[PDB]
């Protein structure tokens, strides 16, 4: 088992993952903020104030009521300044020819500013083949949804094993997974785990929480994705630090 | 076997499906046009010209380079004039509390203009439950993706069975399926099938095509979703009429 910093230097490491692994070690943060907000200003305020505590900011640019590409210009500014990756949670999940256009085009032009995006594997390997054609040119990485935190999730057993396989066979573009635990034995791949809170619980619509120590420590994931656990707190700065320190110590203990 | 007109009067049938099935019968079309264009003027020129030939227009708003809510207004006007339903192929595939926001809010405000939307079942029923909460107020309906057309598709066997159960258990809002064949024998559910062309073949990124006669005639589907088969033609109207006549005669032969 290697440190994040050692993993950033592996032969077969993808550059986007290496950049991420290096700033993870530098900042002592395996925390990804989920910024689920309705206003551009909200997003840029939060990113800036919490930037120092995170390795990655996960966006839903399709829930911004005042999206513009200038808003994402200013997001990249803050990303370069505080050193975090931008991860648009698009969950591309269609045939290759469609996801191509969705990734490069339309009003969002996701490929022009997202270091990472994710994709569901249900369509088969064409969803990644399609995304690759936009991603490789623009030096980007993708994450494959191998597991989900929601109750009734069908991403289990054979489905999970297919997501890993797909990943291993597209390593020039796929840098890791969305998962509830470590699912690949290859240290080149990242693991990011949503459904994370300090306290036991869920929400009213299928979400189920596990703690950072459980997820990073016992389940062997690398990064925790945390939204309401931080945004809904009174002190979002203090909240982000708690999750950072929890996930960071769990990682240290694991080494 | 019942006709679209009879099925539209079924006791346990959704207001949206009933509306759809009546205009199908009235207009003699079970063709959904997949308008995968990136200019609003071409979308509206196709909608206007091909309106009378179609029971439904399937959109990908997020690939339109010049989307405005005013464009959708004009699309709605054409849809009323020519009697077709608007279906946004958004493929909701996140947790319930997330998809609610993507469905209602943000720049696209899909719920305000889309008669139907679709969702993947991989997250568990929470995804349907989240969408339901927004759509039921507005009398919308939802299609669940039970099978896919592309090579390597993991929407098979128990995954499909899962989508059927989830649909049946949420009939108040799920009006049917995106699938390759009839997967539900319950006549209140609509079956819609993409990966359709007249000629045998496929594309370079996993898309596989069967004919209207195979899909409607042998596999028992209701409606064909056809993109490039029409869009790539010089005369898109002649092509639409060709797909319409093929799919409609295939339907009449099942009775
Ligand atoms: O399997 C998943 N689970 C999940 O929670 N998300 C997203 C949805 C939400 O925006 C965030 C979870 O944040 P909370 O910590 O607020 O639940 O991660 C995405 C996937 I794929
Ligand atoms: O399983 C699927 N298969 C599929 O083909 N589409 C959509 C994607 C595209 O917009 C259209 C196919 O267009 P062609 O008929 O040009 O392949 O159907 C959606 C799903 I879910």
From Swiss-Prot, chains A, B:
It catalyses: orotidine 5'-phosphate + diphosphate = orotate + 5-phospho-alpha-D-ribose 1-diphosphate; orotidine 5'-phosphate + H(+) = UMP + CO2. One of its GO terms (biological process) is pyrimidine nucleobase biosynthetic process. Pathway: Pyrimidine metabolism; UMP biosynthesis via de novo pathway; UMP from orotate: step 1/2; Pyrimidine metabolism; UMP biosynthesis via de novo pathway; UMP from orotate: step 2/2. Orotidine 5'-phosphate binds at residues 34, 58, 91, 94, 98, 149, 207-209, 227-228. The active site is at 89 (for ompdecase activity), 91 (for ompdecase activity), 94 (for ompdecase activity). Residues 1-255 are annotated as: OMPdecase. Changing residue 206 to R: In ORAC1; increased OPRT activity; reduced ODC activity; reduced OPRT and ODC activities. The keyword Transcription regulation does not apply. This is Uridine 5'-monophosphate synthase. It comes from Homo sapiens. The chain holds residues 224 to 478 of 480 of the full protein.
